[PDB]
Amino acid sequence: GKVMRRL
Amino acid sequence: KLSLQDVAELIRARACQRVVVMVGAGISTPSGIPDFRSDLPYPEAIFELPFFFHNPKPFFTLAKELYPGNYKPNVTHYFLRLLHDKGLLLRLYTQNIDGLERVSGIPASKLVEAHGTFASATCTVCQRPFPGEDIRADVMADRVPRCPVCTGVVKPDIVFFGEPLPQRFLLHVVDFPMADLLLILGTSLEVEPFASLTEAVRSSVPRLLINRDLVGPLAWHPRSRDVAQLGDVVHGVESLVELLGWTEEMRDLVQRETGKL
Ligand SMILES: Oc1cc(O)cc(/C=C/c2ccc(Br)cc2)c1
Ligand SMILES: [Zn+2]
């Protein structure tokens, strides 16, 4: 999975 | 230490023939692309599937903005095109979703769009694929596109949080050890798995960072052939281009391509 991050 | 100038001489000596390039939002900005932080409960919901399923309009608002033929590549894109035209580009990894790398003329086989593309779309329900052109009028008209098969929402092939990275991303596995130069433009690479990708180049390979600031894995696990050129990305690139003796080549390439855009 594409990692959760801010933006 | 190597200087920028040293890296530049390796390249002109065509001694760097297998440049792997990593890029992010710092190269979109100059084309006018709005930053993705600026109604949503928090800005990341824009790339969250549960929220998308609940209300896709915000996303589709952004799809309208970034849909192909709005924005154009800037001179940083064109520098990467020039690297490619010279036979020096092994692969270009992008975290951006504006598709400006392919508009700049870099062929799809040289690109890894790690967060997907507006070039195509997929029915969220029956998974039928669609060329992006087939949903363009709906998007341009502010109507959520629906599948002719099942009436499900048709979602542009942008990778949302939690979704698998594209297949092509696994070219990293051998692209990085295969590089004889790593170029990092307009991104920190703080987010995994990009961070770990910088570590996968061989020990002797220079890593050249052109970015506002020094951040992420090049700062935490520095190596002796790292070069960081900190400042506006565009201007850092303009400096490398001069040290390469490519300033006039860049002008002429941009003019020829701008003539076409
Ligand atoms: O002269 C060059 C130019 C270049 O782009 C790459 C390499 C090295 C490739 C490589 C791959 C796997 C293992 Br293990 C060890 C070395 C050498
Ligand atoms: Zn469907």
Same domain, B89 and B216: yes
Q: Provide the β-strand partners of residue B113.
A: B94
Contact between B139 and B146 (Cβ < 8 Å): no
Q: Whose CA is nearest to atom 6 of ligand 1?
A: B178
Same domain, B84 and B156: no
Cα–Cα distances in angstroms (integers) from residue B138 to residues B63, B106, B129, B134, B145, in the given order: 11, 28, 16, 9, 6
User: How many domains does chain B fold into?
Assistant: 2
Same domain, B90 and B214: yes
Q: Tokens 């504006």 belong to which residue?
A: B98
* Domain with B110 in it: 1-29+74-114+167-261
Same domain, B201 and B226: yes
CA of A2 to the centre of ligand 2 (A): 24
State yes or no: is B115 an active-site residue: yes
Return the ligand number nearest the Cα of B125.
Answer: 2
Q: Which residues of A touch B159 (CB under 8 A)?
A: 2
Same domain, B83 and B183: yes
Q: Residue B45's domain is classified under what CATH number?
A: 3.30.1600.10
Q: Sign of the C-alpha dihedral, residues B69, B75, B80, B86? A: positive
Note the helical H segments in B72-166.
75-85, 100-103, 136-140
Most A CBs within 10 Å, among B49, B51, B191, to test the A interface: B191
Same domain, B106 and B235: yes
Same domain, B119 and B230: no
Same domain, B238 and B125: no
Same domain, B58 and B23: no
Which structural technique was applied? X-ray
As annotated, the binding site of B includes: 24-38, 95-98, 123, 126, 147, 150, 186-188, 211-213
Note the helical H segments in chain B.
4-12, 49-54, 57-66, 75-85, 100-103, 136-140, 172-178, 194-199, 216-220, 233-244, 247-260
Instruction: Determine, for residues B163 and A2 on separate chains, whether the beta-carbon distance falls below 8 Å.
Output: yes
Same domain, B243 and B192: yes
Q: Provide the β-strand partners of residue B156.
A: B121
Same domain, B184 and B247: yes
Q: Residue B184's domain is classified under what CATH number?
A: 3.40.50.1220
Q: Looking at B130, B148, B166, which one is the last position of a domain? A: B166
